[PDB]
Amino acid sequence: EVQVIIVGLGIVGLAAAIECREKGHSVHAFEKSNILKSIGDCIGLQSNATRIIKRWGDGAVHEALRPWIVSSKEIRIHNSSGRLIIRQDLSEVCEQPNYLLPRSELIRVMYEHALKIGVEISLGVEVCEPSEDEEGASVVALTRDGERQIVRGDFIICSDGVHSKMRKAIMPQPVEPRPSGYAAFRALVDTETLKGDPEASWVFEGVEENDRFDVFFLSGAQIALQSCNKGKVFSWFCIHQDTRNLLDVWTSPADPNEMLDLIKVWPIGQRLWSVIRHTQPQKFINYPLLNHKPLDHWVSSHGRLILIGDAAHPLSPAAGQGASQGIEDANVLATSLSLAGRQRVSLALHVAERIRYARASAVQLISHRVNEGWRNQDWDAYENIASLPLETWIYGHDSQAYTEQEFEMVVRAVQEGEEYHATNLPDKLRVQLGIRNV
Ligand SMILES: Cc1cc2nc3c(=O)[nH]c(=O)nc-3n(C[C@H](O)[C@H](O)[C@H](O)COP(=O)(O)OP(=O)(O)OC[C@H]3O[C@@H](n4cnc5c(N)ncnc54)[C@H](O)[C@@H]3O)c2cc1C
Ligand SMILES: C[C@H]1CCN2C[C@]34Cc5c([nH]c6c7c(ccc56)OC(C)(C)C=CO7)C(C)(C)[C@@H]3C[C@]12C(=O)N4
């Protein structure tokens, strides 16, 4: 069988480990940090990701995620007066299960399942210096004491995220992401104090039957507020202007009073603050929003290393499709591997790339267009960021069925040196954004 080395066990790394293991390959994954640690807030997983997860363990992971199934029927969008300006229907977006849950709860479920099916995992191991010949690939596993050990396999999956040193070490970016001037406050609300605060009691209305999903458009502030799992968890997100050179990390605490000043001058500010103020000061995150440009390649020159997830195509955590596209990366890669075999590993990596590239790039450039904008307080139907790009061509898409159907055509385009034109995204969208094939 094929020996797979996975660097980075975030969401995408864990999914690739499970997807490769379930499709019959040997998997050794490395992670430098304690990942069973409660950090960050909520991740959303849309239908194109949950139909992939549905296959894991013949439904077992889906069943473990069942309390996190989204029950919202609409997105209720308001102006700064509190007036409901738009409802966005979710009956088709949620025809199939969507998930919304803390990142730490999703990491734990995926991680427990990866061990159970025999993924080999090494925590507390920083991986560096990839190398590849035409018969295999290798990485150097570092321990904190200075020790170096060569680890060998058939190819390397770099899922080490937005700060991929794997990417730096191989196919680095010419210039840094440039700061957009916007950042994102985001956090889990503390529920044990949210309860018993009577001025906040209003947020519990109906959350047992329909998870809250409210959005607020203010001047220089886009705010969302969400419940999941029958009101056991509340999260919130506020996009706002910021010129400071922040670090795009997930541990730098920020001053809650900045958020209070943003909203208190508006008639809706008091209601919203009665919830937001129950955030643990340790958990208040101000996360800069950078625009990353698509890479020229995800696969290295010798075909035995591939960047996936945030290493490949970092999206705004306000995309809605960030983790979902990464889970799609994993399934397509593992499906390509099984159709190719151990004698055609480099073929499999090049196929997965042609299948994923234009789609992932379209989500990248769309979700930034919808995030980018200079709207004033009359916010209209299609609209400057409302989370309305729930397109069926995104959430209704079955990436594994597409890979099985297209695999021989892509292989033909690889081997004959021609361009593959994926149809897993609208044709017009490619030309409108200027997507150039890999
Ligand atoms: C601590 C943390 C909290 C986050 N919280 C949120 C959140 O609340 N909401 C949200 O929308 N997104 C959050 N994200 C980002 C989110 O996981 C990603 O945007 C995406 O969903 C998954 O991308 P990924 O798995 O490719 O990369 P990531 O999820 O960023 O994971 C990459 C992993 O690789 C590890 N790594 C890096 N270099 C090496 C190396 N050399 N050797 C070994 N391991 C290495 C990192 O330690 C990390 O565990 C968080 C990310 C992190 C790291
Ligand atoms: C700053 C506010 C303003 C508007 N918000 C919307 C959002 C996109 C989005 C979110 N959750 C989503 C979501 C989705 C689809 C899209 C989103 O669908 C399912 C069905 C999976 C259920 C719950 O989860 C938020 C994290 C709340 C962010 C945060 C934010 C924003 O920019 N983009």
From Swiss-Prot:
Residues binding FAD: V12, E31, D41, G44, R103, V127, D310
Enzyme Commission designation: 1.-.-.-
Effect caused by changing Q226 to A/E: Abrogates the catalytic activity toward paraherquamide L, while paraherquamide K still exhibits about 2% conversion
The species this protein was found in: Penicillium fellutanum
Phenotypic consequence of D41 to A/N: Leads to complete loss of activity
Result of altering S387A: Reduces the catalytic activity toward both paraherquamides K and L
Matches recorded under Pfam families: FAD_binding_3
Consequence the record notes for mutating R186 to A/K: Abrogates the catalytic activity toward paraherquamide L, while paraherquamide K still exhibits about 5-10% conversion
Gene: phqK
Function: FAD-dependent monooxygenase; part of the gene cluster that mediates the biosynthesis of paraherquamide, a fungal indole alkaloid that belongs to a family of natural products containing a characteristic bicyclo[2.2.2]diazaoctane core. Within the pathway, phqK catalyzes spirocycle formation through two parallel pathways in the biosynthesis of paraherquamides A and G, using as substrates paraherquamides K and L, with paraherquamide L, bearing the dioxepin, being likely the favored substrate.
Consequence recorded when altering F213A: Reduces the catalytic activity toward both paraherquamides K and L
InterPro entries registered for this protein in UniProt: FAD-bd (IPR002938), FAD-dep_Monooxygenase_BioMet (IPR050493), FAD/NAD-bd_sf (IPR036188)
The protein's name in its UniProt record: FAD-dependent monooxygenase phqK
GO MF annotations in UniProt: FAD binding; monooxygenase activity
Keywords: FAD, Flavoprotein, Monooxygenase, Oxidoreductase
Names of the cofactor(s): FAD
Family to which the UniProt record says this protein belongs: Belongs to the paxM FAD-dependent monooxygenase family.
